[PDB]
Write a protein that binds this ligand. Structure first.
Ligand code: NAG
Length: 529
């Protein structure tokens, strides 16, 4: 009747009710709650500060701006990934440190429901919380769903490699949002003692990063990485970040005399100017010319990450929470290459062209030139059919970006004594772009529709697709509840232990063993030549 009003640490918020078919209790939704001070002016390239408190009742019933980003690419990704019947257009702003809350709890009664905090993907460059409607997951599984934003691109990841601009601002924003959830979620019927972080692609990489960061201690109790981990190398910069910083500075019209001079100049630029610079840098496509070894992202900054992910894994001081790590069958099948304008159009590929392409693909796969013939031969050499070569080439890219890093992370996590689970998702959603070939199954992002209940929001899902979403949401929420996805009515999902059991999720969901085992061996041996 009366819209719901909730006390938070910094003031009161007003949300709205939305009913979902099948559920008598409306879900209370609060959109655009700030969890930090807007990072404007001198606060650019600094850690997020607490939000300033507000008087009276803040109206939390409209979607916030998305963090500044290429609007064309951001809109396109939102349209492709949204679980909503209609994509919600968003404004851009630097003032973007907001989260959205979907709580199925009757807030007039006592509730301490599991909380699931969603970290969106988009390469650390694009993306928005508001793409993901929490309504269906929250109602079907009785969990509080929180979708967060974090600074993107230059704003989120500009690093001088030193104390004048350490980097990882967007990850610090993710931490700040988690701190806010600890301090406030009980007011929305959530249990701050049961917080599950989950995310896809760059969001899954962020989750994996958080598992490795001391700054995230006591902020979550389970984790889920979907199609991205901290060994997804395209997102993690090792070695010297100064040349990139200088390139950004120069492109923005700034001198490079010192790091502090660069950062000061960049802090005087307008949002418009930094977006112009962003677009000039071409951050989500491959460089046409010159050395492939010459992207923005996560760095080893000394505050969030003290050493490389590989070193932190070997040390097992990371957070040994229950962790679910998964991939999709064909991660490089359609969506990623299409969004990147990846330079492969023909539908066939000879081996010479494959080798040159894999070198030009260095930013994505990080494969040294001397290793390229041996890698290309492994995947493509067994067949003289150039169509088949092309499909195997897409498998090559997927395995290096996603499957191999995911299994290495899951193995290290298990070996530290943490409960670990894996999956491979193999289904082609009806919600796919009708420009995607009918034969691409388990593309990057295809699991999103199941996790977020798209069959309950969008039109056209088959009986099988409806049931697949129910099953997936239930596994995810059981994992949030118990650190173990299993429950009555659901296929058995083995623990990822020394037998390396994992779940093959799709139309016929069943357990299997030793996901990507032969691929991990191949690549690990190759990279150690
Ligand atoms: C809250 O915001 C909506 C627009 O998003 C507006 O229509 C509504 O009247 C507002 N309610 C207030 C300020 O009480």
């Amino acid at each position: 009747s009366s819209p719901p009003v909730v006390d938070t640490v910094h003031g009161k918020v007003l949300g709205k009710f939305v009913s979902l078919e099948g559920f008598a209790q409306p879900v209370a939704i609060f959109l655009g709650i700030p969890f930090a001070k807007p990072p404007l002016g001198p606060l650019r390239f600094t850690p997020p500060q607490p939000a300033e408190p507000w008087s009276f009742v803040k109206n939390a019933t409209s979607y916030p701006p998305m963090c500044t980003q290429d609007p064309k690419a951001g809109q396109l990704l939102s349209e492709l990934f949204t679980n909503r019947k209609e994509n919600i257009p968003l404004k851009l702003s630097e003032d973007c440190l907001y989260l959205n809350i979907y709580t199925p709890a009757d807030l007039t009664k006592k509730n301490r429901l599991p909380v699931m905090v969603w970290i969106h993907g988009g390469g650390l460059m694009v993306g928005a919380a508001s793409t993901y409607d929490g309504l269906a997951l929250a109602a079907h599984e009785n969990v509080v769903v929180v979708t967060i934003q974090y600074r993107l691109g230059i704003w989120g990841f500009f690093s001088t490699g030193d104390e004048h601009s350490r980097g990882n601002w967007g990850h610090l924003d993710q931490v700040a949002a988690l701190r806010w959830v600890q301090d406030n979620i009980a007011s929305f019927g959530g249990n701050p003692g049961s917080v599950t972080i989950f995310g896809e692609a760059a969001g899954g990489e962020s989750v994996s990063v958080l598992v490795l960061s001391p700054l995230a201690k006591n902020l979550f109790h389970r984790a889920i990485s979907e199609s991205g981990v901290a060994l997804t190398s395209v997102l993690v910069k090792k070695g010297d970040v100064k040349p990139l910083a200088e390139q950004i500075a120069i492109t923005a019209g700034c001198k490079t005399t010192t790091s502090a001079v660069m950062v000061h100049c960049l802090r005087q630029k307008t949002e418009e100017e930094l977006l112009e610079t962003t677009l000039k840098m071409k951050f989500l496509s491959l460089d046409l010319q010159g050395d492939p070894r010459e992207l923005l992202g996560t760095v080893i900054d000394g505050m969030l990450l003290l050493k490389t992910p590989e070193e932190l894994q070997a040390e097992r001081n990371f957070h040994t929470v229950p962790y679910m790590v998964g991939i999709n069958k064909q991660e490089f099948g359609w969506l990623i290459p299409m969004l990147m304008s990846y330079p492969l159009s023909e539908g066939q590929l000879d081996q010479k062209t494959a080798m040159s392409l894999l070198w030009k693909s260095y930013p994505l796969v990080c494969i040294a030139k001397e290793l390229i013939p041996e890698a290309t031969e492994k995947y493509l050499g067994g067949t003289d059919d150039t169509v088949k070569k092309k499909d195997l080439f897409l498998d090559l890219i997927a395995d290096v970006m996603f499957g191999v890093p995911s299994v290495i992370v899951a193995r290290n996590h298990r070996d530290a004594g943490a409960p670990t689970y894996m999956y491979e998702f193999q289904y082609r959603p009806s919600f796919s772009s009708d420009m995607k070939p009918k034969t691409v199954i388990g593309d990057h992002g295809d699991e999103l529709f199941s996790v977020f209940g798209a069959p309950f929001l969008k039109e056209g899902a088959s009986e099988e697709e409806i049931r697949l979403s129910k099953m997936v949401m239930k596994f995810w929420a059981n994992f949030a509840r118990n650190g173990n996805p299993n429950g009555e009515g659901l296929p058995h999902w083995p623990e990822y232990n020394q037998k390396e059991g994992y779940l093959q999720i799709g139309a016929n969901t069943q357990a299997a063993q030793k996901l990507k085992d032969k691929e991990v061996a191949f690549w690990t041996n190759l990279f150690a030549k």
